Amino acid sequence: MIQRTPKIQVYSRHPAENGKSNFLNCYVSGFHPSDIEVDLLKNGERIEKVEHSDLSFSKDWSFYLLYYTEFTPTEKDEYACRVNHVTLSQPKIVKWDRDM
């Protein structure tokens, strides 16, 4: 058996075909087992509709999850990714850097 802690990246992108749109992305990578809980938070509160969740694996040992949704951020609001996994003794909260 193997277990691997997820790596978590939080970042924003504008789709080229719709440059005014802005997406907040969670990239949760390299984890095992696949059982996982992932939320986007806005001001400590969970975001309800998250347009997309794309799950894949490399070889059998490793999963990859892209979690993302459109958003309109102000300089006041705060966004984060919360991840819970059996490898983590406490839920991992990764804040969005407004420069990324």
Numbering used by the authors: 0 to 99
What does the published report state?
A recent case of systemic amyloidosis involves the highly unstable D76N mutation of beta-2 microglobulin (β2m). The D76N mutant is strongly amyloidogenic and, in contrast to the wt protein, aggregates efficiently and abundantly without seeding and under native conditions. Indeed, the 76 position is located in a solvent exposed loop between β-strands E and F. A detailed analysis of the interaction energies of the ensembles reveals that D76 is at the center of a network of stabilizing electrostatic interactions that are lost in the D76N mutant.
To better compare these data with crystallographic data, the crystal structures of wt and D76N were determined from diffraction data collected at room temperature (RT) rather than at 100 K. The RT structures are highly comparable in terms of conformation and B factors with structures from frozen crystals. For the wt, the residues showing the highest dispersion are located in the BC-loop, comprising Pro32, as well as residues located in the nearby N-terminus of the protein. A first mode, common to wt and to D76N variant, involves the residues in spatial proximity to Pro32. Our results show the presence of distinct minor conformers exchanging with a major form, on sub-millisecond timescales, within the crystal lattice of both wt and D76N. In keeping with these observations, ensembles resulting from RAM simulations showed that β2m displays two distinct conformational states in both mutant and wt. As sketched in Fig. 7, while globally wt β2m excited state resembles very closely the ground state, D76N populates a conformational ensemble, which is less structured.
